[PDB]
Every structure is written in C-alpha cells, then in structure tokens.
C-alpha cells in the first residue's frame, strides 16, 4: 500500500510539478516546502538510479518536455510526421506544462482549442500590476470587431482587482463560489503569448427563471438585493418579477430514494406531455452515486406499465457480467485461509459451472443439502485442517468425517453398528450414492489445491496458477468464456507488469488476490450512454453535453460534493498553485456546468426528512446557495411592496414543494399541478373497495360411515390445524431450518427429545445403555468427551427414574383390532401393545392436555370394545394420566360426543385450545363437589392463567405464537375468548372429571 501510494504521488508529480523532480534528480532539496521531502527526495533519486541500472530507457515526462520545447522553438515549419491540425474540444482543465507544450507546438501545427467559459468578460485572477497591463489585449470576434472586459480603465482602477488576490468584485456569487477551476483555466489561457483568441458568445433572452440566472452568469453581474439602506430594504419592486406559472427551476423535497425516483418519473411524464416535440433522448438524470440508486431506477422504470413506459439506460454502473463465477474464483483464491464452513462450500457448489464440471445436477444439490444438514458436517475439511488452526483434533464434524459416514452407510446398514467409531448414515444407499463420489472428488481437489497454494513463489511460478484453477475447477460454457478470458487477462496483466519491472523476491498469494479484486471493479460501462433512452448517469468531470432537461438527484449534505481527503503526506496539499486539481473544486465546477448546460428546464431534488425517525436532513450547501440567490433576486408579482426578507421567504416556499411520505396519500391525486400519473394506486387513495371478510364460514360437510381411528388421533392432536390441513387441504409448511454453525456443545429441543425417546425405549427393555451411548458417540450427536459423558449420565439418571416406574407397572401384551359402530359410524384401525390390565403408554415430556386427550380417546375406544382394564400414562417430572374402567354405554356416549365434535370441527374451525383451555378448566373446576365454580376471584385467577398459558414468557413460547391461530385472529378479542372457553369447557370436562 505504501509503494502504490508513493507511485501514484510520483506520477502526479511528473504531470504537474517537474521542477521538484529535476531538483531531486540532482540531490538538493527545495526551500520553503513542507514535511516528507526528507524521505521523498532520496526515494526519487534512488528510483532514477535503479531504473538506470535496470537498463530501461532513462527518458520520462519530467525531463522530456523542456527538450521538446527547445527543439520545436527553433526549427523548420514542418518536421516530419506531424498532423495537419488537432482539436481540443471540451476540456476545461489542463496543466501549465501541457499548455506550454501546446503553445510551443502551435507555431508548426494549427491547433484549434475549444473552451466554454460561462462568463463573457474576463473573470479571472491577476498576478501583478505589471501583468494587468498585459491584459490590455483583445479577443477578436469571428466577423465584426474587438472587445474585452467593460469600462476597462476605471474597472482596473476600482476595487475589481484586489492587491494580490483574484477579482473580488466579479458580482455573481454563484460564479464566484463555483468557478474555481474555470478561473485557473482562464488565467492560464490569457497568460499565453502566441495564442490568438476569438469568441462566439451567443446571448440568452431573459424571460424564464433559468434564463434569468444564465444571463446573469453570462453578462457577469449581480442582481441580488441586500438592502444596505432602509429606503431600499423596505421597498421590494426592484427585483425581477417571476411568473407563478413558470417552472424552469424547481426543487423537490422528498423522503426516501424510492419515493424520489417515483416523483421524478411522474415529473418527466408531465414534461413530455406538456412539450410535444420532446423526446426521451434529450433528458438526463444525474446521480451522486449510481450504485446506491440503480435498484430503485430499475424497479420503478420497470414497474411502469406498457402504456406509460419510457426507456432508460443506466450508464456508468459497474459491470457484473458473470458475478457468481467471479465470486467463485475470488473465494477459491481465498482457499488457504478458509475454515470450510459447510454453508460456504454449498454456496460454492451453487455455481452451475463448477457443478457441471464435477457433474452434480440440480436434482443432486437438494439431496446433498439435506445430507450435509443431517449428517453433521460443520467444520474444516480434514483433521489436518483442524490441527492447522492450532485446536484440539477431535476428528468428528469434519467434511472427511461426513464423507466417511456417507460411504460407510452405503456399504453398511445403520442398525448393525459402528466400525471405526463412525456410525453409518442410513440414507445414501442406492443409485443416488454416486453424488457422494462426485462430492468426494470435489473435496479431494479442494484439499490438494489448498495444500498447493500455500507457499510463496516468485511471479514466474505464479503465472500458470490461474490457468490451472480455471481448467481444473470449471467447465467452460458459451456464457462463461467471456468471464474466464477476462480473469486470465487481468491476472496475466498484473504478473506482466510485475515481471517487466524485474521483481525477484517471494510474493504471497493474498497480495495478488487483493490486487485482482481491487482491479476487477475499476471497469465501468457506458456503451449505452446517449443511445436514445433517458440517460441515467453519475456526475463525471469534463463531460458537458448540452441537454434539454437536467435532473439532479440526491443532493443531501455530505453526499455531494463527494469527499476525497488528500493523503496527508502529499506535497501538493501544503503549497498549491494555479492549475492544480482537487475533487471538491471539481464537484463544485460540475454543479456550475450542470446549471449552465441545462437549456430548457432544471430539476433539483434532495432527501428532506428521513423516513424512519421523521428527523430533518438538510440539502447540500450548493443547493442552499442557489435557493438563497433565487430568493434574494426575485419576487412574486402579488406582494409588490412587502419586504426583502418576506419576498425571499415567499418565493422560497413557492419554489420548493414537499412530497407525500407514502404514495397512496390523496394529496398526490388532488387536482392541480402536482397530480401523479400512477393510476394503479387510485382505488387505494380514494378508498373504493371492501375490507377483508372473516375466515370463519359455515362449510357444507357430510360425515362418512367409515372413520379410521388415526383420523381421530390426527384430528384431536390439534383441532384448528386439523381443520386447516384436513378439510380444505392447506398446510403452511415452513422452510427447513438452516445448517448450524458449530458442533453441538449442548443439546436442546428436538435434538435431545429424540435422544431421550430412544434412551427410554431402550431402558424400559432393561438393556445396557452403553451400546446405545457408543452408537450416539459414533453418530457425532452428543457433545465432545467428558461433557458428552456428563450429559449422558444425567439423562440416564432421569430416564432411569422414569423407567423404574414404567417397569413397576408393566405386563407384556400384544396388539388388538378395533371395529365399533358409534352413532351408525364405523371406526376402523388398530391399537398397539394393549396388555391385560389395559393400555400403557410412556412418553418423555411434560404434562400436556393434548396428550391427555390422546390417551382419553385411545382409552374410550378400548373401553367401548370390551376390555375391563385401566389406562395409564407416564411422563417426566412424575406426571401421570390414569383413567378408571367404565361401562360400555358410558364409553359409547363419550365417544359419540367426540365424533360429534369431529364432524362439527371439520365444518367450522372448532375452538378447542388444549393447553390454555385446559389450564382455565383446571383453575375453575373443583374436584370436591365436582361442579363448575362461579366466584369472581377464581374467574379472575382463571382469566390471568389463561392469558399466561396463551402467551408465554419471554423465553418460553406460548400457544398464541402459532400460524394456525395467527391466520384466524391476531389479537385475542374477549368475545372470541368467551367462545373458546365455552367450547373448551364443553369438550375437556371428561378429562378433568375422570383424571385420578
């Protein structure tokens, strides 16, 4: 970075100040200069000595120009090879060395130089009083006569010219504040000796506001009223009148850039509608930075329909022809520092070029995604890559571990067991397994190249690495050849300059990769600049094309002028001179030339108030000064004699128009002038359509005669969800959860629920848990080592406590068949593992009313089908659900109630909330008198218990946060609360009546 900055500074020295280089080539310093000379002069002298020692030619632009000027100052008229004439059109900044060279060459070739100064008279600075008499020369008109700055005797005599400084009395504050580059250029042009200068200054008739401003700039005057004396300050009829229907210059305060471009589009359509022979070629829209405005441009200009479409062409935007393979190659150069996160490697396989090279198709990408998600692949590619980061080599959760798991699962079956402490993966088993072979080929290539790209080699050995990367990882298609050739060209050019400059030492890869990435975004595109559409572009120096409508967008404070602070140790920032160029003066002069080049109408727009916090964000200083000048030199025709300040405030409020925050505001569509063309939002603004009807509708449903028991189980697991995905067959199936970042340190949720379920089902069978613990350890599911052992032993201690109680009340049993006839509706299905004492189920969870419902239904079916026995359930924290044996008539009556609830709930979203309604019913219903209570204190306790069960705490999720309820209602209204508690009381009271 130091060498690049120093080389840029030295090139700038070469162009701009050759005297310093001529001095430093000898070895002396320069007096009166800032710091950093003490290390910059020996650097330059050593560079000259080194480039002489390399045998490269000594000649350069610092010591060449003097010899060139001396050669052409005294010779024949035509030394051979010279052109007949050469034009310099539209450049308003040239170095003094270049101008000296041009006047030296001008005696031999006729050189036509074309320059657009906005002023007419002489508006430059002055060097010395002995130089002012030299400015008694004169421009010659093309046909008529000669003229210069007006009243040239007493103007030089008066305070127009300062003691040493520039023309302080130019008049026009716009010109004085902005033309900093133009003043230096005109001072350089009038300083030439042999130049023969001529003018062609076409006048502008002051009728419009814009033409008033342009004429004031041209004739170099100042019509702004300040009001030194009170008889001037009171009266206000001396400024020019402004037509209230005149819209040459307008300002548009907006809110957000999307709203800003939406306003601009409508105004351009209005301008095209008003002026008949205006075409979308002649309209330019100039943006402070195009990369942060282009998406909104594309969005609204594409969202315009066919009847209201005017074509756009976003020039000066950075090109991205094959962005995915560009990023793939940059990330592939970033290989040796990568930790190989599985998400990033799958984003690498998202590349179609590389997938086709390693023959994995889009069908196979989904299966690899699911297999990486489930198989436990998170970390570095090998064990060696884990050790290379100086970490403990655990072996598990690596890419090699996952691929070993996949291959071992192809050769194995998962029920057999581990082989080398790797539990095989049961999914990859058939013809789909060759995707694993292709993935392992990918990993072998990536591992070999991350080994190979590590060392530091000279540039001659860095030459073929890019070709090796491209032809080893990518399969060239018809689309990809452009990007691949461009990448090879840029890499070759970098190493070509490095080799031609005779560099010998070692070069690490990160340097070359950073240089390639920094060069790959320096190539803009502007092929479709003025090809016919509306020309969207960013503001660029020395590009002054006269258009009809100039629109400037995004002129907030700080955004424009675009800031570029100098390097600090630059030696032009300390002691500047005349022709020096800096970015602030550059951007100010571009604003001035944008004002001049607009021929018909102007459009300045800036963000007024931030849309988030509704704060205030000010316009740029340039727009503020323009508005101040307009207000200080105009007045509305009504208030002929009000005040200077009152007239200024009136015209400032008249010109600037605010804009609505959101497009469907009827202030947009109210008639007049600020009337949008967006017919799409007109019903939204005028409120011409009905609101949303309630989702609960009475649906026609007829109950069949054969209802399988799994239908009732799936229904009573969750009734509203069963209505959604069973009646009208909508299921809001959410996406898959993404790949976790790291290996499991702790296990929560489903990942431990499955472990507890398998452990409990093994422990009830009185089997040793060591085999299953080894199975999980080889699975890469438990935490590492001692932490895994601790977690396993505490889970063993809890499931042993549960399984003791399960064993103490268990008799071996078998299945049975179910076939009843309840209300004339047959029930089919099976019941698993019913024992002579009845139904036993064990489940590692907390006490849930939905599971109580499940056991109650499964037990009513059994008790209606004979079966004198009890039904028990065993849960965590010594939860329990016991039901006594009943009579057949009672069981059929209760099952009739459940089937009737099913047939109602398939037709309407039956409102049985199992957890919340269960908690409310448990609070209210008393098991002493077996009656429903009514006292207001217990009703209020049940109310707050129901709310605490509906919405949970901040770190538990209540039953409210579910899409099946959010689809029906958002905020729980008390009337629906009364309805749901009535339905839940109707349907859940057998459970709390018979729970013992």
């Amino acid at each position: 970075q130091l060498s690049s900055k120093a080389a840029d500074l030295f090139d700038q020295y070469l162009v701009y100040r050759p005297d310093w280089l001529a001095q430093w080539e000898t070895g002396h310093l320069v007096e009166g200069l800032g710091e950093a000379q003490a290390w910059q002069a020996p650097l330059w002298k050593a560079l000259v000595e080194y480039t002489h020692q390399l045998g490269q030619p000594r000649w350069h632009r610092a010591n060449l120009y003097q010899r060139f000027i001396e050669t052409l100052e005294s010779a024949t008229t035509c030394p051979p090879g010279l052109p007949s004439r050469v034009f310099i059109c539209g450049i308003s900044a040239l170095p003094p060395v270049y101008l000296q060279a041009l006047q030296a060459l001008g005696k031999h070739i006729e050189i036509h130089l074309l320059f657009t100064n906005p002023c007419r008279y002489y508006w430059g600075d002055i060097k010395d009083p002995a130089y002012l008499a030299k400015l008694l020369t004169r421009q010659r008109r093309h046909s008529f006569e000669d003229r210069e700055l007006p009243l040239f005797r007493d103007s030089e005599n008066a305070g127009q010219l300062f003691n040493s400084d520039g023309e302080q009395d130019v008049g026009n504050p716009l010109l004085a504040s902005w033309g900093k580059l133009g003043r230096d250029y005109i001072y350089l042009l009038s300083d030439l000796e042999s130049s023969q200068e001529l003018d062609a200054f076409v006048d502008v008739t002051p009728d419009n506001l814009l033409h008033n401003i342009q004429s004031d700039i041209l004739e170099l005057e100042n019509r702004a009223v300040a009001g030194v004396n009170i008889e001037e300050f009171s009266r206000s009829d001396n400024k020019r009148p402004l037509d209230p229907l005149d819209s040459s210059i307008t300002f548009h305060v907006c809110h957000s850039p999307q709203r800003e471009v939406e306003v601009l589009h409508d105004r351009l359509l209005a301008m095209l509608e008003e002026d008949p022979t205006l075409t979308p070629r002649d309209i330019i829209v100039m943006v402070a930075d195009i990369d942060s405005y282009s998406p909104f441009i594309q969005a609204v200009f594409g969202s315009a329909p066919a009847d209201r479409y005017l074509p756009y062409a976003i020039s000066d935007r950075r090109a991205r022809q094959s962005h995915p393979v560009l990023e793939a190659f940059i990330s592939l150069l970033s290989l040796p520092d990568s930790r190989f996160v599985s998400e990033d490697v799958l984003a690498l396989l998202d590349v179609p070029v590389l997938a086709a090279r390693f023959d994995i198709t889009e069908e196979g990408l989904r299966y690899l995604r699911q297999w990486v998600n489930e198989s436990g692949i998170r970390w570095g590619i090998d064990d060696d890559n884990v050790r290379e980061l100086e970490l403990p080599a655990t072996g598990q959760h690596t890419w090699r571990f996952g691929l070993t798991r996949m291959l071992l699962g192809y050769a194995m079956e998962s029920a057999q067991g581990e082989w080398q402490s790797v539990l095989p993966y049961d999914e990859s088993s058939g013809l789909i397994a060759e995707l694993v072979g292709h993935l392992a080929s990918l990993l072998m290539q990536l591992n070999i190249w991350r080994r190979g790209l590590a060392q530091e080699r000279p540039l001659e050995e860095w030459l073929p690495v890019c070709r090796d990367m491209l032809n080893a990882f990518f399969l060239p298609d018809a689309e990809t050849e452009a990007a691949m050739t461009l990448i090879e060209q840029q890499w070759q050019a970098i190493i070509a300059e490095g080799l031609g400059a005779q560099y010998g030492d070692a070069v690490p890869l990160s340097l070359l990769r950073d240089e390639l990435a920094q060069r790959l975004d320096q190539e803009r595109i502007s092929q479709r600049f003025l090809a016919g559409p509306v020309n969207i572009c960013t503001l660029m120096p020395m590009r002054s094309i006269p258009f009809k409508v100039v629109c400037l967008l995004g002129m907030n404070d700080g955004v424009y002028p675009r800031q570029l602070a100098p390097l600090g140790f630059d030696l032009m920032s300390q002691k500047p001179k005349r022709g020096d160029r800096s970015r602030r003066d550059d951007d100010r002069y571009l604003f001035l030339e944008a004002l001049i080049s607009a021929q018909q109408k102007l459009y300045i727009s800036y963000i007024g108030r931030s849309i988030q916090d509704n704060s205030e964000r000010f316009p740029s200083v340039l727009v503020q000064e323009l508005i101040d000048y307009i207000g200080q030199s105009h007045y509305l025709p009504g208030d002929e004699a009000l005040n200077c300040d009152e007239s200024e405030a009136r015209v400032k409020a008249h010109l600037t128009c605010l804009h609505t925050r959101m497009p469907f505001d009827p202030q947009n569509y109210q008639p007049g002038e600020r009337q949008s063309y967006a017919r799409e939002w007109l019903p939204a603004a005028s409120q011409a359509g009905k609101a949303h009807s309630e989702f609960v509708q009475p649906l026609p449903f007829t109950l069949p005669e054969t209802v399988p028991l799994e239908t009732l189980q799936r229904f009573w697991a969750h009734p509203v969800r069963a209505f959604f995905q069973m009646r009208l067959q909508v299921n809001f199936r959410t996406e898959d959860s993404e790949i976790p970042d790291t290996e499991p340190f702790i296990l929560e949720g489903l990942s431990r629920y499955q472990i507890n379920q398998q452990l409990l089902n093994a422990l009830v069978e009185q089997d040793d848990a060591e085999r299953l613990f080894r199975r999980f350890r080889a699975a890469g599911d438990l935490p590492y080592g001692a932490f895994g052992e601790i977690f396993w032993e505490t889970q063993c201690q809890e499931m042993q406590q549960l399984a003791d109680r399960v064993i103490a009340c268990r008799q071996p049993g078998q299945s049975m068949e179910i076939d009843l006839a309840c209300n004339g509706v047959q029930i089919t299905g099976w019941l698993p593992q019913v024992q002579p004492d009845g139904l036993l189920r064990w489940r590692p969870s907390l006490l849930s009313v939905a599971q109580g419902m499940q056991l109650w239904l499964e037990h009513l079916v059994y008790c209606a089908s004979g079966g004198n026995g009890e039904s028990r359930l065993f849960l965590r924290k010594d939860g329990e659900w016991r039901f006594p044996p009943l009579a057949a008539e009672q069981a059929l009556h209760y099952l009739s109630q459940l089937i009737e609830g099913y047939r109602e709930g398939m037709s309407a979203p039956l409102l049985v909330l199992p957890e919340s309604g269960g908690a409310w019913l448990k609070t209210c219903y008393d098991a002493q008198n077996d009656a429903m209570l009514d006292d207001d204190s217990t009703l209020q306790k049940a109310r707050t218990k129901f709310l605490q069960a509906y919405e949970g705490n901040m770190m538990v999720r209540g039953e409210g946060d579910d899409i099946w309820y959010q689809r029906l209602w958002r905020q729980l209204t008390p009337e629906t609360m009364e309805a749901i508690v009535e339905q839940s009381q109707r349907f859940l009271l057998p459970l709390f009546r018979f729970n013992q």
């Binding site: 359509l269 209005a270 075409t279 009847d307 209201r308 569509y669 009337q675 017919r679 603004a685 005028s686």
Partner: peptide, 25 residues
Amino acid sequence: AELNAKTLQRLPGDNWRVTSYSGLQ
C-alpha cells in the same frame, strides 16, 4: 374529496436505437 389521476394521451417515447448490426442480422 373528489380526485382522479391524469392520463398521458400521446405516446411517451419514439422508436429510436443505435444498432450494431444486431437487429439487421
């Protein structure tokens, strides 16, 4: 209020291009 959106009646743009022997070919 009573409100409506103005309608552009003429065609907004012409048919102009700079072709590079693509439309002809």
